[PDB]
Amino acid sequence: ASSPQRGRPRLNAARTTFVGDNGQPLRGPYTSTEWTAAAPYDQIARVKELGFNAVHLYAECFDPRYPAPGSKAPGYAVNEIDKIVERTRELGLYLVITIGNGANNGNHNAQWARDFWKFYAPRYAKETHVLYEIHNEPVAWGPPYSSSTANPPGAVDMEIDVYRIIRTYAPETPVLLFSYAVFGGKGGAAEALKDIRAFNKAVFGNENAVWTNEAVAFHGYAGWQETTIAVEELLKAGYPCFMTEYAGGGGLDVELTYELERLGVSWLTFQYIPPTGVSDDVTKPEYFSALVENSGLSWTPDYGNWPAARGVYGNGGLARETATWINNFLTGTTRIEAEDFDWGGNGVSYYDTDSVNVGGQYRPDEGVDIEKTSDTGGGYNVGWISEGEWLEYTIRVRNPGYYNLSLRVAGISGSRVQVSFGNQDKTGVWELPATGGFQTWTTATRQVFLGAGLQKLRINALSGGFNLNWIELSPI
Ligand SMILES: O[C@@H]1[C@@H](O)[C@@H](O)CO[C@H]1O
Ligand SMILES: O[C@@H]1[C@@H](O)[C@@H](O)CO[C@H]1O
Ligand SMILES: [Ca+2]
Ligand SMILES: [Ca+2]
Ligand SMILES: [Ca+2]
Protein backbone atom coordinates (compact mmCIF):
# COMPACT_ATOMS: atom_id res chain seq x y z
CA ALA A 1 0.00 0.00 0.00
CA SER A 2 0.99 3.66 0.11
CA SER A 3 -1.57 4.66 2.77
CA PRO A 4 -3.35 3.18 5.75
CA GLN A 5 -6.31 2.27 3.47
CA ARG A 6 -7.53 -1.23 4.32
CA GLY A 7 -7.70 -4.10 1.89
CA ARG A 8 -11.01 -5.80 0.97
CA PRO A 9 -12.66 -7.56 3.86
CA ARG A 10 -13.55 -11.16 2.94
CA LEU A 11 -15.40 -14.10 4.37
CA ASN A 12 -13.26 -15.80 6.96
CA ALA A 13 -12.02 -19.39 6.74
CA ALA A 14 -14.87 -20.66 8.96
CA ARG A 15 -17.49 -18.81 6.83
CA THR A 16 -19.01 -17.16 9.92
CA THR A 17 -18.53 -13.48 8.94
CA PHE A 18 -16.53 -10.86 7.07
CA VAL A 19 -13.04 -10.24 8.45
CA GLY A 20 -10.57 -7.52 7.49
CA ASP A 21 -7.18 -7.62 5.81
CA ASN A 22 -5.60 -9.07 8.99
CA GLY A 23 -8.23 -11.80 9.58
CA GLN A 24 -9.92 -9.94 12.44
CA PRO A 25 -13.63 -9.17 12.76
CA LEU A 26 -15.00 -5.74 11.99
CA ARG A 27 -16.11 -3.94 15.13
CA GLY A 28 -17.46 -0.44 15.22
CA PRO A 29 -20.02 2.23 16.15
CA TYR A 30 -22.28 4.26 13.78
CA THR A 31 -22.83 7.67 12.35
CA SER A 32 -25.28 9.27 9.93
CA THR A 33 -25.15 11.66 6.99
CA GLU A 34 -28.96 11.46 6.51
CA TRP A 35 -29.47 15.08 7.46
CA THR A 36 -26.22 16.24 9.14
CA ALA A 37 -22.68 17.03 8.14
CA ALA A 38 -20.19 14.20 8.10
CA ALA A 39 -18.76 13.49 11.54
CA PRO A 40 -15.46 15.41 11.93
CA TYR A 41 -12.13 13.77 11.24
CA ASP A 42 -11.00 14.04 14.90
CA GLN A 43 -14.14 12.25 16.20
CA ILE A 44 -13.91 9.43 13.59
CA ALA A 45 -10.26 9.03 14.62
CA ARG A 46 -11.28 8.41 18.23
CA VAL A 47 -13.00 5.15 17.34
CA LYS A 48 -9.48 3.65 16.86
CA GLU A 49 -8.68 4.37 20.52
CA LEU A 50 -11.87 2.51 21.54
CA GLY A 51 -10.72 -0.69 19.93
CA PHE A 52 -12.76 -0.33 16.77
CA ASN A 53 -11.79 -0.79 13.13
CA ALA A 54 -15.07 0.00 11.33
CA VAL A 55 -17.85 2.53 11.01
CA HIS A 56 -21.55 1.92 10.19
CA LEU A 57 -22.97 4.71 8.05
CA TYR A 58 -26.65 5.45 7.67
CA ALA A 59 -25.92 7.45 4.52
CA GLU A 60 -29.34 8.78 3.38
CA CYS A 61 -32.88 8.33 4.64
CA PHE A 62 -35.29 7.00 1.98
CA ASP A 63 -38.27 9.08 0.85
CA PRO A 64 -41.52 7.07 1.19
CA ARG A 65 -43.25 9.23 -1.49
CA TYR A 66 -40.56 8.95 -4.23
CA PRO A 67 -40.85 9.52 -7.16
CA ALA A 68 -43.83 11.85 -6.56
CA PRO A 69 -43.46 15.58 -7.09
CA GLY A 70 -41.55 17.23 -4.22
CA SER A 71 -39.98 13.92 -3.08
CA LYS A 72 -36.27 13.82 -2.31
CA ALA A 73 -34.20 11.71 -4.67
CA PRO A 74 -31.25 9.68 -3.54
CA GLY A 75 -27.83 11.25 -3.82
CA TYR A 76 -28.61 14.43 -1.87
CA ALA A 77 -25.90 13.66 0.79
CA VAL A 78 -23.11 12.77 -1.67
CA ASN A 79 -20.68 15.44 -0.47
CA GLU A 80 -21.08 14.25 3.12
CA ILE A 81 -20.79 10.58 2.27
CA ASP A 82 -17.66 11.32 0.22
CA LYS A 83 -16.18 12.87 3.39
CA ILE A 84 -16.92 9.75 5.48
CA VAL A 85 -15.38 7.55 2.72
CA GLU A 86 -12.17 9.65 2.60
CA ARG A 87 -11.86 9.94 6.37
CA THR A 88 -12.25 6.20 6.98
CA ARG A 89 -9.91 5.55 4.03
CA GLU A 90 -7.10 7.62 5.56
CA LEU A 91 -7.73 6.38 9.13
CA GLY A 92 -7.42 2.67 8.20
CA LEU A 93 -11.09 1.98 9.02
CA TYR A 94 -13.74 -0.17 7.30
CA LEU A 95 -17.00 1.52 6.30
CA VAL A 96 -20.45 -0.20 5.96
CA ILE A 97 -22.80 2.01 3.97
CA THR A 98 -26.60 1.59 4.18
CA ILE A 99 -29.95 3.32 3.55
CA GLY A 100 -31.72 4.48 6.73
CA ASN A 101 -35.42 4.80 7.34
CA GLY A 102 -36.23 7.71 9.66
CA ALA A 103 -39.90 7.46 10.67
CA ASN A 104 -40.28 4.36 8.49
CA ASN A 105 -38.29 1.57 10.11
CA GLY A 106 -39.68 -1.78 9.00
CA ASN A 107 -40.46 -0.42 5.54
CA HIS A 108 -38.77 0.57 2.28
CA ASN A 109 -39.35 2.23 -1.11
CA ALA A 110 -38.01 -0.19 -3.74
CA GLN A 111 -37.55 2.39 -6.49
CA TRP A 112 -35.73 4.78 -4.12
CA ALA A 113 -33.36 1.96 -3.06
CA ARG A 114 -32.60 0.90 -6.64
CA ASP A 115 -31.84 4.51 -7.60
CA PHE A 116 -29.65 4.98 -4.49
CA TRP A 117 -27.49 2.00 -5.45
CA LYS A 118 -27.36 2.88 -9.14
CA PHE A 119 -25.63 6.07 -8.03
CA TYR A 120 -23.54 4.90 -5.09
CA ALA A 121 -22.51 1.39 -6.06
CA PRO A 122 -20.23 2.53 -8.90
CA ARG A 123 -19.12 5.62 -6.93
CA TYR A 124 -17.39 3.58 -4.18
CA ALA A 125 -16.73 0.33 -6.07
CA LYS A 126 -13.00 0.89 -6.02
CA GLU A 127 -12.77 1.84 -2.31
CA THR A 128 -11.43 -1.41 -0.86
CA HIS A 129 -12.40 -0.46 2.70
CA VAL A 130 -16.13 -0.03 1.87
CA LEU A 131 -18.94 -2.62 2.20
CA TYR A 132 -22.52 -2.23 1.02
CA GLU A 133 -25.56 -3.02 3.17
CA ILE A 134 -28.61 -3.04 0.86
CA HIS A 135 -31.20 -1.48 3.19
CA ASN A 136 -31.74 -0.98 6.90
CA GLU A 137 -34.78 -2.84 8.49
CA PRO A 138 -36.89 -2.92 5.27
CA VAL A 139 -39.73 -5.04 6.81
CA ALA A 140 -41.61 -4.94 10.11
CA TRP A 141 -39.82 -6.72 11.80
CA GLY A 142 -37.87 -9.73 10.55
CA PRO A 143 -38.02 -12.90 8.44
CA PRO A 144 -39.60 -14.29 6.34
CA TYR A 145 -39.58 -11.32 4.00
CA SER A 146 -40.62 -13.76 1.26
CA SER A 147 -44.03 -14.40 2.84
CA SER A 148 -47.01 -12.98 0.91
CA THR A 149 -48.19 -11.39 4.19
CA ALA A 150 -44.86 -9.67 5.10
CA ASN A 151 -45.32 -6.05 6.16
CA PRO A 152 -44.62 -4.85 3.55
CA PRO A 153 -44.43 -7.57 0.86
CA GLY A 154 -41.75 -7.85 -1.81
CA ALA A 155 -38.57 -7.01 0.10
CA VAL A 156 -36.80 -10.09 -1.34
CA ASP A 157 -37.49 -8.66 -4.82
CA MET A 158 -35.81 -5.44 -3.74
CA GLU A 159 -32.83 -7.43 -2.35
CA ILE A 160 -32.49 -9.29 -5.65
CA ASP A 161 -32.81 -6.15 -7.84
CA VAL A 162 -30.40 -4.13 -5.68
CA TYR A 163 -27.91 -7.02 -5.56
CA ARG A 164 -27.89 -7.14 -9.37
CA ILE A 165 -27.33 -3.37 -9.53
CA ILE A 166 -24.51 -3.53 -7.01
CA ARG A 167 -22.74 -6.47 -8.65
CA THR A 168 -22.98 -4.91 -12.11
CA TYR A 169 -21.11 -1.77 -10.97
CA ALA A 170 -19.17 -3.01 -7.91
CA PRO A 171 -18.20 -6.61 -8.63
CA GLU A 172 -15.82 -7.13 -5.68
CA THR A 173 -17.65 -5.13 -2.95
CA PRO A 174 -18.95 -7.11 0.08
CA VAL A 175 -22.77 -7.09 0.23
CA LEU A 176 -24.77 -7.48 3.40
CA LEU A 177 -28.34 -8.75 2.91
CA PHE A 178 -31.72 -8.36 4.64
CA SER A 179 -30.79 -6.35 7.73
CA TYR A 180 -33.36 -8.13 9.89
CA ALA A 181 -34.54 -5.99 12.81
CA VAL A 182 -35.59 -8.99 14.93
CA PHE A 183 -33.64 -12.16 14.30
CA GLY A 184 -34.40 -14.72 17.02
CA GLY A 185 -34.69 -18.41 17.83
CA LYS A 186 -34.41 -21.55 15.76
CA GLY A 187 -37.57 -20.25 14.05
CA GLY A 188 -35.95 -16.96 13.05
CA ALA A 189 -33.10 -18.86 11.41
CA ALA A 190 -35.53 -21.16 9.60
CA GLU A 191 -37.55 -18.18 8.28
CA ALA A 192 -34.32 -16.43 7.17
CA LEU A 193 -33.40 -19.60 5.31
CA LYS A 194 -36.65 -19.32 3.27
CA ASP A 195 -35.55 -15.78 2.27
CA ILE A 196 -32.03 -16.94 1.48
CA ARG A 197 -33.25 -19.81 -0.66
CA ALA A 198 -35.52 -17.49 -2.64
CA PHE A 199 -32.79 -14.88 -3.11
CA ASN A 200 -30.30 -17.60 -4.09
CA LYS A 201 -32.58 -19.20 -6.65
CA ALA A 202 -33.19 -15.82 -8.31
CA VAL A 203 -29.59 -14.55 -8.25
CA PHE A 204 -27.42 -17.70 -8.42
CA GLY A 205 -29.77 -20.31 -9.98
CA ASN A 206 -29.59 -22.67 -6.97
CA GLU A 207 -31.41 -22.37 -3.61
CA ASN A 208 -28.24 -23.73 -1.85
CA ALA A 209 -25.60 -21.41 -3.25
CA VAL A 210 -22.31 -21.05 -1.38
CA TRP A 211 -21.76 -17.30 -0.97
CA THR A 212 -18.28 -16.01 -1.83
CA ASN A 213 -18.74 -12.32 -0.83
CA GLU A 214 -22.10 -11.87 0.90
CA ALA A 215 -23.47 -12.23 4.44
CA VAL A 216 -26.75 -11.81 6.31
CA ALA A 217 -26.97 -8.48 8.10
CA PHE A 218 -29.06 -8.72 11.27
CA HIS A 219 -29.91 -6.59 14.28
CA GLY A 220 -30.18 -7.45 18.00
CA TYR A 221 -33.81 -6.53 18.75
CA ALA A 222 -34.92 -10.15 19.47
CA GLY A 223 -32.67 -9.81 22.61
CA TRP A 224 -29.28 -11.36 23.21
CA GLN A 225 -30.42 -14.91 24.04
CA GLU A 226 -32.76 -15.44 21.09
CA THR A 227 -30.42 -13.61 18.71
CA THR A 228 -27.57 -15.91 19.71
CA ILE A 229 -29.71 -18.97 18.97
CA ALA A 230 -30.72 -17.64 15.54
CA VAL A 231 -27.09 -16.86 14.65
CA GLU A 232 -25.87 -20.30 15.79
CA GLU A 233 -28.54 -22.02 13.67
CA LEU A 234 -27.83 -19.92 10.57
CA LEU A 235 -24.09 -20.56 10.89
CA LYS A 236 -24.87 -24.33 11.07
CA ALA A 237 -26.87 -23.92 7.88
CA GLY A 238 -23.74 -22.57 6.16
CA TYR A 239 -24.60 -18.87 5.80
CA PRO A 240 -22.30 -16.15 7.23
CA CYS A 241 -23.68 -13.17 9.05
CA PHE A 242 -22.79 -9.73 10.33
CA MET A 243 -24.31 -7.81 13.22
CA THR A 244 -25.14 -4.27 11.99
CA GLU A 245 -27.23 -2.66 14.80
CA TYR A 246 -27.86 -3.55 18.43
CA ALA A 247 -27.96 -1.99 21.89
CA GLY A 248 -28.55 -2.98 25.49
CA GLY A 249 -31.85 -1.02 25.59
CA GLY A 250 -29.08 2.23 25.86
CA GLY A 251 -25.32 1.33 25.78
CA LEU A 252 -23.38 -1.69 24.53
CA ASP A 253 -25.21 -5.02 24.79
CA VAL A 254 -22.40 -6.76 26.66
CA GLU A 255 -24.03 -10.17 26.57
CA LEU A 256 -24.70 -10.17 22.84
CA THR A 257 -21.19 -8.82 22.22
CA TYR A 258 -19.74 -11.71 24.23
CA GLU A 259 -21.70 -14.27 22.19
CA LEU A 260 -20.75 -12.67 18.87
CA GLU A 261 -17.10 -12.75 19.90
CA ARG A 262 -17.48 -16.43 20.80
CA LEU A 263 -19.20 -17.24 17.49
CA GLY A 264 -16.80 -15.21 15.27
CA VAL A 265 -19.24 -12.62 14.05
CA SER A 266 -18.46 -8.97 13.19
CA TRP A 267 -20.57 -6.29 14.82
CA LEU A 268 -21.62 -2.68 14.57
CA THR A 269 -23.07 -1.30 17.78
CA PHE A 270 -25.81 1.35 17.98
CA GLN A 271 -23.81 4.04 19.76
CA TYR A 272 -22.86 7.10 17.74
CA ILE A 273 -19.72 9.00 16.81
CA PRO A 274 -19.90 12.56 18.24
CA PRO A 275 -21.27 15.09 17.85
CA THR A 276 -24.66 13.68 17.17
CA GLY A 277 -26.96 10.69 16.71
CA VAL A 278 -30.36 9.21 17.59
CA SER A 279 -29.18 6.96 20.45
CA ASP A 280 -26.20 7.20 22.88
CA ASP A 281 -22.67 8.59 22.41
CA VAL A 282 -20.07 5.77 22.04
CA THR A 283 -17.32 7.99 23.57
CA LYS A 284 -19.12 8.40 26.91
CA PRO A 285 -17.71 5.66 29.19
CA GLU A 286 -21.11 4.71 30.59
CA TYR A 287 -22.43 3.58 27.18
CA PHE A 288 -19.36 1.64 25.99
CA SER A 289 -15.86 1.70 27.46
CA ALA A 290 -16.88 1.25 31.09
CA LEU A 291 -19.24 -1.56 30.15
CA VAL A 292 -16.37 -3.29 28.37
CA GLU A 293 -13.87 -2.60 31.21
CA ASN A 294 -16.26 -3.76 34.01
CA SER A 295 -17.42 -6.92 32.21
CA GLY A 296 -14.01 -8.21 31.20
CA LEU A 297 -14.94 -8.36 27.53
CA SER A 298 -11.82 -8.36 25.34
CA TRP A 299 -10.80 -8.62 21.72
CA THR A 300 -7.63 -7.86 19.79
CA PRO A 301 -8.03 -4.28 18.48
CA ASP A 302 -6.46 -3.22 15.18
CA TYR A 303 -5.11 -0.03 16.80
CA GLY A 304 -3.85 0.83 20.28
CA ASN A 305 -3.86 -1.40 23.31
CA TRP A 306 -7.47 -1.08 24.45
CA PRO A 307 -9.23 -3.32 25.33
CA ALA A 308 -6.25 -4.89 27.06
CA ALA A 309 -5.37 -8.40 25.99
CA ARG A 310 -6.93 -10.60 28.68
CA GLY A 311 -9.14 -13.61 29.24
CA VAL A 312 -10.41 -16.42 31.42
CA TYR A 313 -7.83 -18.96 32.62
CA GLY A 314 -9.18 -22.48 32.09
CA ASN A 315 -12.88 -23.23 31.65
CA GLY A 316 -12.18 -23.43 27.87
CA GLY A 317 -11.74 -19.65 27.81
CA LEU A 318 -15.44 -19.18 28.65
CA ALA A 319 -16.58 -16.83 31.40
CA ARG A 320 -17.29 -18.84 34.54
CA GLU A 321 -21.09 -19.08 34.76
CA THR A 322 -22.73 -19.04 38.17
CA ALA A 323 -24.52 -22.13 39.40
CA THR A 324 -28.23 -22.33 40.19
CA TRP A 325 -30.42 -24.47 42.41
CA ILE A 326 -32.85 -27.16 41.32
CA ASN A 327 -34.75 -28.25 44.40
CA ASN A 328 -31.93 -28.85 46.93
CA PHE A 329 -28.96 -29.32 44.50
CA LEU A 330 -26.51 -27.16 42.60
CA THR A 331 -26.46 -27.39 38.82
CA GLY A 332 -22.75 -26.77 38.34
CA THR A 333 -19.55 -25.84 40.02
CA THR A 334 -19.55 -22.93 42.41
CA ARG A 335 -15.80 -22.97 43.05
CA ILE A 336 -13.29 -20.70 41.31
CA GLU A 337 -9.69 -21.62 42.14
CA ALA A 338 -7.73 -18.56 43.32
CA GLU A 339 -4.83 -19.62 41.06
CA ASP A 340 -7.19 -19.40 38.00
CA PHE A 341 -7.24 -15.57 37.90
CA ASP A 342 -7.66 -14.06 34.40
CA TRP A 343 -4.55 -13.93 32.20
CA GLY A 344 -3.52 -10.48 30.95
CA GLY A 345 -0.72 -9.52 33.29
CA ASN A 346 0.46 -7.21 35.96
CA GLY A 347 -1.69 -4.13 36.12
CA VAL A 348 -4.26 -5.76 33.79
CA SER A 349 -5.77 -8.97 35.30
CA TYR A 350 -3.86 -8.89 38.61
CA TYR A 351 -1.53 -6.57 40.45
CA ASP A 352 1.48 -8.08 42.18
CA THR A 353 4.27 -6.21 43.94
CA ASP A 354 6.97 -8.47 42.31
CA SER A 355 6.95 -9.66 38.71
CA VAL A 356 8.23 -13.12 39.82
CA ASN A 357 6.00 -15.94 41.04
CA VAL A 358 8.10 -16.75 44.09
CA GLY A 359 6.18 -19.91 44.90
CA GLY A 360 7.10 -21.20 41.43
CA GLN A 361 3.95 -23.38 41.00
CA TYR A 362 1.17 -23.73 38.44
CA ARG A 363 1.73 -20.50 36.47
CA PRO A 364 5.47 -19.93 36.79
CA ASP A 365 5.64 -17.18 34.16
CA GLU A 366 3.10 -14.81 35.72
CA GLY A 367 3.53 -12.47 38.69
CA VAL A 368 1.07 -14.00 41.14
CA ASP A 369 2.75 -16.07 43.89
CA ILE A 370 1.40 -19.63 43.93
CA GLU A 371 2.36 -22.64 46.05
CA LYS A 372 0.96 -26.14 46.66
CA THR A 373 -1.76 -26.30 49.33
CA SER A 374 -2.37 -29.01 51.92
CA ASP A 375 -6.04 -27.95 52.27
CA THR A 376 -8.84 -30.39 51.48
CA GLY A 377 -8.80 -31.08 47.73
CA GLY A 378 -5.13 -30.24 47.22
CA GLY A 379 -3.99 -28.18 44.25
CA TYR A 380 -2.64 -24.71 44.92
CA ASN A 381 -3.11 -21.50 46.83
CA VAL A 382 -2.18 -17.94 46.17
CA GLY A 383 0.29 -16.72 48.81
CA TRP A 384 2.71 -13.86 49.43
CA ILE A 385 -0.25 -11.53 49.39
CA SER A 386 0.47 -7.90 50.27
CA GLU A 387 -1.48 -4.69 50.72
CA GLY A 388 -2.76 -3.31 47.39
CA GLU A 389 -2.45 -6.59 45.47
CA TRP A 390 -5.51 -7.68 43.51
CA LEU A 391 -6.81 -10.56 41.41
CA GLU A 392 -9.55 -10.61 38.78
CA TYR A 393 -11.82 -13.47 37.60
CA THR A 394 -14.24 -13.06 34.69
CA ILE A 395 -17.61 -14.55 35.63
CA ARG A 396 -21.12 -14.55 34.29
CA VAL A 397 -23.95 -14.20 36.76
CA ARG A 398 -27.00 -16.08 35.51
CA ASN A 399 -29.64 -14.39 37.70
CA PRO A 400 -29.70 -11.12 39.65
CA GLY A 401 -30.05 -11.32 43.42
CA TYR A 402 -28.43 -12.41 46.67
CA TYR A 403 -25.40 -14.74 46.66
CA ASN A 404 -23.18 -16.26 49.31
CA LEU A 405 -19.61 -15.30 48.50
CA SER A 406 -17.08 -17.54 50.24
CA LEU A 407 -13.29 -17.19 50.44
CA ARG A 408 -11.17 -20.15 51.51
CA VAL A 409 -8.40 -18.50 53.54
CA ALA A 410 -5.53 -19.16 55.93
CA GLY A 411 -3.60 -16.65 58.03
CA ILE A 412 -1.36 -16.44 61.07
CA SER A 413 -2.93 -13.16 62.06
CA GLY A 414 -5.90 -11.00 60.97
CA SER A 415 -6.28 -9.63 57.48
CA ARG A 416 -8.61 -7.56 55.36
CA VAL A 417 -10.05 -7.81 51.81
CA GLN A 418 -12.70 -6.06 49.78
CA VAL A 419 -14.46 -7.60 46.77
CA SER A 420 -15.77 -5.79 43.70
CA PHE A 421 -18.03 -7.13 40.95
CA GLY A 422 -18.06 -5.16 37.71
CA ASN A 423 -16.01 -2.49 39.52
CA GLN A 424 -18.79 -2.06 42.14
CA ASP A 425 -17.97 -2.72 45.81
CA LYS A 426 -20.14 -5.57 47.07
CA THR A 427 -18.56 -6.27 50.48
CA GLY A 428 -17.01 -3.14 51.97
CA VAL A 429 -14.11 -3.88 54.29
CA TRP A 430 -14.15 -7.60 55.04
CA GLU A 431 -12.20 -8.61 58.20
CA LEU A 432 -10.81 -12.15 57.70
CA PRO A 433 -10.29 -14.55 60.52
CA ALA A 434 -6.78 -15.30 61.92
CA THR A 435 -6.59 -19.08 61.68
CA GLY A 436 -3.18 -19.43 63.36
CA GLY A 437 -1.32 -20.74 60.32
CA PHE A 438 -0.78 -20.25 56.59
CA GLN A 439 -2.03 -23.79 55.84
CA THR A 440 -4.72 -23.73 58.56
CA TRP A 441 -7.81 -23.15 56.45
CA THR A 442 -11.26 -21.66 57.08
CA THR A 443 -14.13 -20.56 54.92
CA ALA A 444 -15.27 -16.96 55.32
CA THR A 445 -18.68 -16.07 53.89
CA ARG A 446 -20.52 -12.79 53.21
CA GLN A 447 -23.85 -12.19 51.48
CA VAL A 448 -23.63 -9.98 48.36
CA PHE A 449 -26.24 -8.59 45.99
CA LEU A 450 -25.33 -9.11 42.31
CA GLY A 451 -26.63 -7.94 38.99
CA ALA A 452 -26.84 -10.48 36.14
CA GLY A 453 -24.34 -10.64 33.35
CA LEU A 454 -20.71 -10.82 32.42
CA GLN A 455 -18.67 -9.13 35.14
CA LYS A 456 -15.21 -9.21 36.73
CA LEU A 457 -14.88 -10.41 40.27
CA ARG A 458 -11.95 -8.50 41.79
CA ILE A 459 -10.39 -9.45 45.10
CA ASN A 460 -8.59 -6.46 46.68
CA ALA A 461 -6.08 -7.24 49.44
CA LEU A 462 -6.40 -4.46 51.99
CA SER A 463 -3.60 -6.08 54.00
CA GLY A 464 -1.20 -8.95 53.63
CA GLY A 465 -1.02 -11.92 56.00
CA PHE A 466 -3.42 -14.38 54.35
CA ASN A 467 -3.40 -17.10 51.73
CA LEU A 468 -6.29 -17.75 49.33
CA ASN A 469 -7.20 -21.22 48.04
CA TRP A 470 -10.50 -20.61 46.23
CA ILE A 471 -13.66 -18.53 45.92
CA GLU A 472 -17.25 -19.91 45.93
CA LEU A 473 -20.40 -18.18 44.81
CA SER A 474 -23.93 -19.58 45.04
CA PRO A 475 -27.45 -18.13 45.11
CA ILE A 476 -29.08 -17.82 48.52
O1 LIG B 1 -33.59 4.04 10.28
C1 LIG B 1 -33.04 4.85 11.29
C2 LIG B 1 -32.07 5.85 10.68
O2 LIG B 1 -32.85 6.73 9.86
C3 LIG B 1 -31.30 6.60 11.78
O3 LIG B 1 -32.20 7.46 12.57
C4 LIG B 1 -30.68 5.54 12.70
O4 LIG B 1 -31.76 4.83 13.34
C5 LIG B 1 -32.44 3.98 12.42
O5 LIG B 1 -33.47 3.29 13.12
O1 LIG C 1 1.88 -16.59 51.89
C1 LIG C 1 2.92 -17.10 52.74
C2 LIG C 1 4.12 -16.16 52.55
O2 LIG C 1 3.78 -14.81 52.95
C3 LIG C 1 5.35 -16.70 53.25
O3 LIG C 1 5.20 -16.50 54.66
C4 LIG C 1 5.59 -18.18 52.92
O4 LIG C 1 4.42 -18.97 53.13
C5 LIG C 1 3.31 -18.53 52.35
O5 LIG C 1 2.21 -19.44 52.54
CA1 LIG D 1 5.07 -12.01 42.73
CA1 LIG E 1 2.20 -11.29 45.74
CA1 LIG F 1 -6.75 -23.59 44.89
Numbering used by the authors: 35 to 283, 290 to 516
Question: What does the original paper state about this entry?
Answer:
The GH5 arabinoxylanase (CtXyl5A) derived from Clostridium thermocellum displays an absolute requirement for xylans that contain Araf side chains. In this enzyme, the key specificity determinant is the Araf appended to O3 of the Xylp bound in the active site (−1 subsite). The dockerin domain recruits the enzyme into the cellulosome, a multienzyme plant cell wall degrading complex presented on the surface of C. thermocellum.
To understand the structural basis for the biochemical properties of CtXyl5A, the crystal structure of the enzyme with ligands that occupy the substrate binding cleft and the critical −2* subsite were sought. The data presented in Fig. 3A show the structure of the CtXyl5A derivative CtGH5-CtCBM6 in complex with arabinose bound in the −2* pocket. Interestingly, the bound arabinose was in the pyranose conformation rather than in its furanose form found in arabinoxylans. O1 was facing toward the active site −1 subsite, indicative of the bound arabinose being in the right orientation to be linked to the xylan backbone via an α-1,3 linkage. As discussed on below, the axial O4 of the Arap did not interact with the −2* subsite, suggesting that the pocket might be capable of binding a xylose molecule. Analysis of the three structures showed that O1, O2, O3, and the endocyclic oxygen occupied identical positions in the Arap, Araf, and Xylp ligands bound in the −2* subsite and thus made identical interactions with the pocket. O1 makes a polar contact with Nδ2 of Asn139, O2 is within hydrogen bonding distance with Oδ1 of Asn139 and the backbone N of Asn135, and O3 interacts with the N of Gly136 and Oϵ2 of Glu68. Although O4 of Arap does not make a direct interaction with the enzyme, O4 and O5 of Xylp and Araf, respectively, form hydrogen bonds with Oϵ1 of Glu68. Finally Tyr92 makes apolar parallel interactions with the pyranose or furanose rings of the three sugars.
